[PDB]
């Protein structure tokens, strides 16, 4: 259903057999059989709207770009992954099988009901979703030939990442990290660690766009200690990723590590706008 008359933005109820419920999805067609752009939300994803629409002119920017914008809604602290145990937070439990939903249910449903090409898509995520995007492309290269990672912890299985992710998950809905990928030594951790699986991005020649601020705010804003420290903190993993990608022979990446930016939406939005033309070219978009 369209949100308003005269505008292309739609709100959808896409059924998810794996999660036993309907997942809300904001959508905007880029035309029949047009490539898809999946925008993943951050750690504190709400159930009403995607952080992308709440905080950015995304839909408006991509209107007529030839790309179909797909914004799933919900999944706080989900990391868009398929969890071992039910996702139990302060507000009860739910089934989290986001990798399944994103790699089969949603694609299929969009192809059949909105004529969205199921392969040759881009998946861009920020914060939590940042590594999710890289990971999705790594295990589903035919579907996602392009992955965008903004301000993410790219080596989640390393150093204190497991503990830090747990602290984050606990503060955002009160979820438990072990319910998702189990204890730190469980194979799930190094499987969902992009820095450790960079070789696949290189082998598959996936178009990679990684972004991360240095912690110093600019005129764009986001000037507060938490936003500054987080950005500075996750930047390290981003550099390690760039070095691994380069060392490994990667030759289809873009690394934007400016001398500014914090962990806030003003920066992620500006970045999503900056990558529009690159996205169109790589996905073969046809304007209008």
Consult the annotation and say whether 235 binds a ligand.
Answer: yes
Tell me if 186 is assigned to a ligand binding site: no
233 annotated among ligand-binding-site residues: yes
Q: How far is residue 125's CA from residue 133's CA, in Å, rounded to a whole number?
A: 6
Which residues sit opposite 93 in a β-bridge? 88
263 marked ligand binding residue: yes
Please indicate if the annotation marks 265 as binding a ligand.
yes
Q: Residue 123, exposed/middle/buried by CB under 10 A (0-12, 13-18, 19+)?
A: buried
The residue annotated as part of the active site, out of 151, 231, 237, 266, is: 231
Active-site hit among 16, 121, 127, 132: 127
Helix residue spans in 118-264 (DSSP H): 128-139, 161-171, 177-181, 188-191, 198-204, 225-247
Catalytic residue among 77, 78, 263, 266: 263
155 labelled binding-site residue: yes
44 is in an annotated binding site: yes
What's the gap between Cα 117 and its chain centre?
19
Number of helices (H), then strands (E), in the chain: 12, 10
Backbone conformation region of residue 219, classed left if phi is above 0, alpha if psi is from -120 to 50, else beta: alpha
Host H or E run for residue 266: helix 265-274
Asked if residue 18 belongs to a known ligand binding site, the reply is no
Q: What's 246's DSSP letter?
A: H
CA dihedral 22, 25, 30, 36 (to 10 degrees): -80
Chain centroid to CA 21: 21
Q: Residue 165: which of 174, 156, 173, 155 has the closest Cα?
A: 156
236 is in an annotated binding site: yes
140 flagged as catalytic: no
For residues 242-258, b (16+ Cβ closer than 10 Å) or e, as one string? Answer: bebbeeeebebbebeee
Which residues are documented as binding site for substrate?
43-44, 127, 155, 233-236, 240, 263-265
Active site members: 127, 231, 263
Which residues are documented as binding site?
43-44, 127, 155, 233-236, 240, 263-265
């Amino acid at each position: 259903a369209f949100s308003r008359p005269g505008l292309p933005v739609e709100y959808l109820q896409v059924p998810s057999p794996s999660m036993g419920r309907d997942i809300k999805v904001q959508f905007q067609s880029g035309g029949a059989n047009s490539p898809a752009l999946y925008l993943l939300d951050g750690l504190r994803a709400q159930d009403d709207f995607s952080g992308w629409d709440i905080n950015t002119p995304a839909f408006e920017w991509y209107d007529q770009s030839g790309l179909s914008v797909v914004m799933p809604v919900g999944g706080q602290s989900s990391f868009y992954s398929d969890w071992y145990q039910p996702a139990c937070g302060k507000a009860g439990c739910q089934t989290y099988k986001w990798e399944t939903f994103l790699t089969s249910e949603l694609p299929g449903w969009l192809q059949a009901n909105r004529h969205v090409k199921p392969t040759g898509s881009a998946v861009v995520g920020l914060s939590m979703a940042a590594s999710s995007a890289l990971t999705l492309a790594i295990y589903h290269p035919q579907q996602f030939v392009y992955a965008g990672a903004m301000s993410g912890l790219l080596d989640p299985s390393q150093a204190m990442g497991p503990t830090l992710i747990g602290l984050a998950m606990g503060d955002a809905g009160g979820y438990k990290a072990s319910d998702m990928w189990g204890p730190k030594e469980d194979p799930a951790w190094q499987r969902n660690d992009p820095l450790l699986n960079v070789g696949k991005l290189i082998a598959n020649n996936t178009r990679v766009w990684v972004y991360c601020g240095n912690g110093k705010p600019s005129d764009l804003g986001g000037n507060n200690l938490p936003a500054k420290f987080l950005e500075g903190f996750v930047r390290t993993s981003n550099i390690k990723f760039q070095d691994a990608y380069n060392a490994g022979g990667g030759h289809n990446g873009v690394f934007d590590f400016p001398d500014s930016g914090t962990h806030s939406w003003e920066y992620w939005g500006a970045q999503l706008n900056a990558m529009k033309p690159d996205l169109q070219r790589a996905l073969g978009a046809t304007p209008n």
